[PDB]
Amino acid sequence: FEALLGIYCNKIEWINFFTTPIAVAANVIRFNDVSRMTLGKVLFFIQL
Amino acid sequence: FEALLGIYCNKIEWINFFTTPIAVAANVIRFNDVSRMTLGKVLFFIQL
């Protein structure tokens, strides 16, 4: 006989964005209409 | 649309004279007519 041993499958690890340490550079906010947003802008006022 | 995010500004930092360590070399007294003082002198008397 040709005998086949237990099939073994891979287990993919899972990544959350706030687990990985690039999110300390990030600052992430949901906003459901940024598909419709054309330009976001911030405006700064510096005095010296 | 064309969004406008928050508007930020600078904090112009304040400095007191007696906070900085130049004032240990300094010794500062108000005198409201030094505009009218031509010269101020001190006189030292050494004996040997």
The distance of B16 to chain A (nearest Cα, Å) reads 17
Residue B3 near residue A33, CB atoms below 8 Å: no
Q: Do A41 and B10 touch (CB under 8 A)?
A: no
Q: Do A40 and B5 touch (CB under 8 A)?
A: yes
Please tell me whether residue A48 adopts helix, strand or coil conformation. Answer: coil
Terminal Cα distance for chain A, rounded:
87
Q: What is the resolution of this structure in A?
A: 9.0
Name the residue among A5, A31, A37, A6 with its Cα closest to residue B2: A37
Tokens linked to B30: 């108000």
Torsion angles phi and psi, residue B30, rounded to 5: -75, 145
Strand ranges in chain A using DSSP code E only, listed in sequence order:
43-45
Closest residue to B2, CB basis, from A38, A46, A48: A38
Please tell me whether residue A43 adopts helix, strand or coil conformation. Answer: strand
- Distance of alpha carbon A47 from the chain centroid: 37
**What's the rounded Cα separation, in Å, for the pair B38 and B29?**
17
Q: Do A40 and B10 touch (CB under 8 A)?
A: no
Please tell me whether residue A45 adopts helix, strand or coil conformation. Answer: strand
Q: Do A37 and B6 touch (CB under 8 A)?
A: no
Contacts with A48 (C-beta within 8 Å, 6 or more apart), sequence order: B10, B12
Q: State which approach was used to obtain the coordinates.
A: cryo-EM
Residue A44 near residue B4, CB atoms below 8 Å: no
